[PDB]
Design a protein around this ligand. Structure first.
Ligand SMILES: Nc1ncnc2c1ncn2[C@@H]1O[C@@H]2CO[P@](O)(=S)O[C@H]2[C@H]1O
Ligand SMILES: Nc1ncnc2c1ncn2[C@@H]1O[C@@H]2CO[P@](O)(=S)O[C@H]2[C@H]1O
Ligand SMILES: Nc1ncnc2c1ncn2[C@@H]1O[C@@H]2CO[P@](O)(=S)O[C@H]2[C@H]1O
Ligand SMILES: Nc1ncnc2c1ncn2[C@@H]1O[C@@H]2CO[P@](O)(=S)O[C@H]2[C@H]1O
Lengths: 627, 150, 627, 150
């Protein structure tokens, strides 16, 4: 029987095969496989015996050439820097992951006892017989806990794991061959982008240093030297991707800046002494509207109930507690201030001490008040919040629809390119969790409302019915030119301004509009149909090519529901399936911005809008234009 | 074909209610980017138009009010402020579609956590009423059932 | 936790779900399922407890509404007429087969001990979550042996089993609803056709009587009455299909005739007393060239070395031993005779005592000799075996190509319709294993050679080159008309006659043939291309519609390789996958014959061919026509 | 593209050799009705044209002889008769394609069962030679390897 199972596959007789198959039926690791599959395996499965404990089946770093089932005895799973991470016993199988992913072995397998017996299936046989059938989740284990869960979604991809095991996984599977540059970077991108949620720099940077200096615990001197050299090239590659993701954001992180400076010293010393890193060392040497930074300082007015104010000077990323303390420095108080945002319509929100970088989250005409709690209900808005009382039609009427739309789109591109991809993550998971600003995202989001309220403001301040018909016409044209420049954000902002209750009320104005522009507008409006998850908008944006500005409210909605719809941790493990979903949404933005976009009076106008954002005021004005 | 709208301030539990109704949290992954993300067959096909995440974009809620046939006004019974935020949304609904009556329900969400409670059943009752919990899945389906009945 | 698992699916909270999932990971029955699948099951799996041993989960015959996993305790699998067939323990699952096949439960499940706990998944949930993922072979067991193995090939179909368990399976799954007549019969057909190989009538008939009289061991009086009534309707249905498959062949089987006569008495008595079987009883009452039968008697000449002969009178299905004994009766011998077949070319084959119905397996001009073994090498053929020495061109030249082909096809249809489908099975698995004649198949197969040698004979006996060109032409036309009548068998026979070495040799004749008919023939020849498993022939026959006569040598080849390529038994179980493969080939024939096919001198000629089948003779004749 | 032909009397083991080479008995089910039933890649694509089952149809063997480029003449070393049946097939090969030389091998099949043996290695050797076993899978691939070499 062992004789039979020792015979080369091609030397097994029909009755050998039959006898083998009947025995395969008593093996629990094959129990979920079909009859068809098990008779194929009868001709291909190898019996392997080894006498001595401490015998090595395979080593970490090697190519995956076999899948094994333990028949008798036990084995240690051994990992450089951790020793024996677990032990497998009679009935367990191992070695499938490397085979299927065409990845290096992530562990050595060492016989734990004398006289162990194995069933082994080699690679080409595994791939023809078992690849889409041996579909068990891969569950890597350390000290009797799951540490990495991978599944077929064709390779096994990471579904969940610990931060450390996920890092170890993404490090090891880096391919250094130049022909694979883009593929390797793509694979690393989810980790490099999303680690801030589950493995912040305080933990990641020491982990990277530890990995950089890792040494194998097995092999000849040359083998050990080569392993550790490629390990270091892999760590360097990851650091390069990590550094590139942050760009200028690294200055906000002292830990990360200190790590990278010291890492550069390590690599240049090692490059010299080991004569290595010829390509990677110069890459690393490089690294060692303009965007607002969290450490930039703001001069900000904070109001009292009597409408006097204090001017504070604090970092953009200051918390509400830091704002309160700065205000108290200047008012010389110990009388329990709260910070309240106040809208032009008198709507008030108390901020939490916890809230960070609140300055850019005010509405268009919002202000910040500091007051004792007893004053909350008596606060009243400032005249400056209430917006203009005279139109600007006389200015922009004399500007071409095309020039306006173009200058709008140019300014919109400066604002959109100022937003770092990481701000989308910080905004979604909550700013206080990172103590980072999303100032650039905040100001770009506010632009949508500014444009929208610009439309409503100018229509509602236009007393003459005739000129008001010409306004409606001109905005419809401005929108059409925005959509032509692929600025879908500012296009929907104008269309939605036109849809505002205060503007749609004006039958005498709409009735009088040439039905050419009535049809243009009715179509724009249908593009906003929320039906079947904004299918009309979705397909529209889908047809377009890279240099485009998407409909930003729907992007924020997508991100919100990705975060709320999905748990960050599953059984105390990072839910990496969620991480990829978030990272995909942010790479959509990267794609929109992957190609560049190709009259000082028009420029100045478009960039200095003054707007009414008090809906009550606008409706009152509307009602007296057309009762 | 139906179109129900979820309204209320932030941090109330609108998105949780929406996902817990259309699919369920944790039993399945939730992809908000596909044609059927907010559609559920219930015998009627409902779309849930939810303002979670887009509260700062007032044009978004107006667009949904225009398309919405039923309305959920949600507050957190752990928050004062959110309850008081409710009068205005009710009013804005009557303005966008130019009507007199619209089917709707008042929802006191987060009812499971009562050591943090500051609003009472009474206040919401004074103010269709339901005390629900998206996470504890109390009254999730009921909310949207009532609105097809209205 | 039990509380949690007792809560209706829709009442489970997000943390209930998380807690449930972590526990699902400790359950071995779910171990081959994805993470995705197990979190879906977290919201759907029911915990079920029962206190008392002897509690019934479900009964045999009921609809499959749930799949179960045992968490604690054990259950008995109970079958009417067999008691407890096996016991399942902690970690085993059951109930999947009925659920997936939409079939009745094949067993009752009864708690074996006090306090058993189960995880249960109900049908609509099983089908949406687990149907194409819970793909484990179904292995039904009795007294610790597999008895039925079923697999997804969408339902689980029978792959292997014992004869009794296969019968039990096919009986139970009969659907009696008239709208399902054709579907029900189709499902039964493999068993009904192939049982002769693994469950001959000697075993099947008593099994059917036992099943007819089976009574349930569970249920109220009405439930028991209804179960046993439908059981009887199911047995009757199977008997009707079994009886129909045999038709007139039943007369050859005394056991089977006696069974059916007594079964008719049982059913008519029961019909009266139970007021049942109103439709089935009259169907059964009906049942209670012409084909040759195994019990028909032949007058057959058996030759001595001196070319005298004995005429014996024996059944067509007589064995060689019976032939020898009949010859010895007439020659008054005790001198150890052997039977040898002798061909016209002097080629000799010793027959085995075992061989049955050998008379129709002689070559066209073969004879049977009886002799002591010492005479074997000295036997010489008879003048009558050597065939005609003068042509018949003067007769059939005066017959239309169309009349010949039509009369050929008519005779071929009589011969082909004489072949019972079961003869194809007997011929494949070996006649002695059944002691049945394949006389009809034998004579139909010999017809192929007769037509072929007719061609060669007439060409080779035609001395005048000019008339021989006209012969070649006329056969090419006869073939074309055969192929038009969809008689592909006789078409290839003529084409292959024309390809015979003795005919293809005749360059002066082929050279002289109008190139119109040279092209016709070259095309016919390409249709015979063996390339890619006779693709040219295969696709040709595939396009044609029912009333057709296939190329019979390729049918025999297919059957041969199905039998030799595949084991009849796998682990001492019937290999039912092989059974279906054989049965498919025979239903292909049934399909070819499913529609009917739509000049006494031409008739007489076509049916009384005299032929040379001695290839040496034919080549010698050829060489003297054209040196 | 190659085309090898298997010849010999019935009960010799031609079909077993053919299946054991192209796929294998019992490891996989054998379907003789598909385009690839007798084709195997070996770097060459072989079709095996086997006379198993059709020995009574002499036109079938002639058709295959016409298309065949290599030839296996198989006997059973448990049978006298089958060995003696071999001279004629060799001769018929030279006649159908009109030639002088054709690549071929002589095969003594069933070599594993020697308590039933009646033909010796010697007789076959006197008569390319191989003593094989289809069931014991001795020399199955070798047979068809030799013929591509010839
Ligand atoms: N094939 C193998 N791979 C890795 N370590 C091995 C091994 N065989 C033996 N060992 C030893 O086992 C030790 C376990 O702890 P380490 O610090 S990883 O160092 C390891 C080696 O010294
Ligand atoms: N924590 C862990 N890390 C790596 N491999 C592990 C592990 N726990 C178990 N293994 C098994 O050890 C095997 C080492 O080679 P692989 O092809 S990466 O497949 C691995 C798993 O089957
Ligand atoms: N649900 C059930 N189905 C079938 N038999 C049952 C049963 N519960 C108890 N039994 C009894 O168990 C007995 C086992 O042997 P039997 O001849 S099948 O008769 C059976 C019944 O008397
Ligand atoms: N010999 C056997 N016959 C029938 N069912 C059996 C069996 N051995 C085990 N079982 C199990 O008992 C269950 C009875 O209901 P099923 O849906 S037919 O599925 C069956 C199998 O899971």
């Amino acid at each position: 029987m062992r004789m039979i199972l020792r015979k080369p596959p091609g030397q097994r007789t029909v009755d050998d095969l039959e006898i083998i198959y009947d025995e395969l039926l008593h093996i629990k690791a094959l129990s979920h496989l079909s009859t068809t599959v098990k008779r194929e395996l009868a001709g291909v499965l190898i019996f392997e015996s080894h006498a001595k404990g401490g015998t090595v089946l395979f080593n970490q770093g090697e190519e995956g050439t076999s899948w094994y089932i333990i028949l008798k005895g036990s084995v240690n799973v051994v990992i450089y820097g951790k020793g024996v991470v677990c032990t497998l016993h009679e009935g367990d199988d191992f070695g499938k992951l490397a085979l299927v992913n065409d990845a290096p072995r992530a562990a050595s397998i060492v016989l734990r006892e004398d006289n162990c017996h194995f069933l082994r299936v080699d690679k080409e046989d595994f791939n023809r017989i078992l690849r889409d059938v041996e579909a068990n989740t891969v569950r890597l284990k350390e000290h009797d806990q799951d540490v990495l869960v991978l599944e077929k979604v064709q390779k096994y991809t990471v579904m969940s794991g610990t931060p450390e095991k996920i890092l170890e996984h993404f490090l090891e599977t880096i391919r250094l061959e130049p022909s694979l540059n883009e593929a390797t970077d793509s694979v690393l991108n989810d980790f490099v982008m999303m680690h801030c949620v589950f493995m912040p720099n305080t933990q990641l940077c020491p982990a990277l240093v530890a990995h950089y200096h890792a040494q194998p615990s097995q092999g000849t001197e040359q083998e050990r030297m080569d392993y550790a050299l490629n390990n270091k090239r892999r760590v360097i590659r990851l650091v390069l991707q990590w550094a590139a993701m942050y760009g200028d954001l690294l200055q906000e992180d002292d830990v990360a800046m200190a790590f990278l400076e010291e890492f550069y010293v390590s690599v240049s010393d090692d490059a010299r002494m080991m004569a290595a890193f010829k390509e990677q060392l110069p890459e690393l040497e490089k690294i060692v509207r303009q965007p607002i930074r969290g450490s930039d300082e703001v001069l900000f007015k904070v109001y009292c109930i009597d409408h006097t104010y204090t001017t504070i000077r604090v970092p953009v990323a200051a918390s509400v507690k830091e704002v309160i303390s700065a205000v108290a420095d200047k008012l010389g108080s110990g009388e329990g201030l709260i910070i309240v945002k106040m809208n032009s319509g008198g709507e008030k929100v108390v901020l939490k001490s916890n809230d960070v970088s609140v300055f850019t989250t005010l509405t268009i005409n919002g202000r910040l008040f500091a007051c004792p709690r007893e004053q909350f209900d008596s606060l009243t808005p400032l005249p400056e919040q209430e917006g203009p009382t005279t139109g600007t039609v006389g200015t922009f009427e004399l500007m071409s629809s095309k020039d306006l739309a173009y200058q709008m789109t140019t300014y919109d591109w400066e604002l959109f390119n100022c937003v770092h991809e990481l701000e989308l993550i910080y905004h979604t998971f909550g700013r206080h969790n990172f103590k980072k600003t999303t100032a650039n995202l905040d100001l770009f989001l506010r632009r949508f409302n500014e444009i929208q309220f610009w439309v409503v403001t100018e229509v509602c301040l236009c007393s003459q019915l005739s000129k008001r018909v010409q306004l409606l016409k001109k905005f419809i044209k401005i929108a059409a030119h925005c959509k032509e420049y692929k600025n879908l954000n500012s296009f929907f902002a104008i269309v939605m301004g036109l849809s505002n209750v205060a503007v749609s009320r004006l039958a005498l104005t709409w009735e009088k509009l040439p039905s050419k522009f009535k049809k243009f507008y009715a179509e724009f409006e249908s593009l906003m149909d929320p039906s079947r998850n904004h299918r009309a908008y979705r397909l529209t944006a889908a047809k377009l090519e890279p240099p485009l500005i998407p409909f930003m409210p729907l992007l924020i909605k997508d991100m919100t529901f990705t975060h709320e719809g999905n748990k960050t941790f599953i059984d105390n493990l990072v839910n990496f399936e969620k991480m990829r979903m978030i990272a995909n949404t942010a790479r959509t933005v990267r794609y929109y911005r992957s190609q560049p976009f190709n009259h000082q009076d028009v420029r100045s106008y478009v960039r200095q809008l003054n707007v009414i954002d008090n809906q009550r005021t606008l409706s009152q004005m509307s009602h007296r234009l057309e009762p | 074909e139906y179109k129900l709208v979820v309204l209320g301030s932030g941090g109330v539990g609108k998105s949780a209610l929406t996902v817990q109704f259309v699919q369920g949290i944790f039993v399945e992954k939730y992809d908000p980017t596909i044609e059927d993300s907010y559609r559920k067959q219930v015998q009627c096909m409902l779309e849930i138009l939810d303002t979670a995440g887009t509260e700062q974009f007032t044009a978004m809620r107006d667009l949904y009010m225009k398309n919405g046939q039923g309305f959920a006004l949600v507050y957190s019974i752990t928050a004062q402020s959110t309850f008081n935020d409710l009068q205005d949304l009710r009013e804005q609904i009557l303005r966008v579609k130019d009507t007199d009556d619209v089917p709707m329900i008042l929802v006191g969400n987060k009812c499971d956590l009562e050591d943090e409670r500051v609003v009472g059943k009474e206040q919401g009752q004074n103010l269709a009423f339901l005390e629900s919990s998206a996470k504890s899945k109390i009254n999730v389906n009921e909310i949207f059932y009532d609105l097809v009945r209205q």
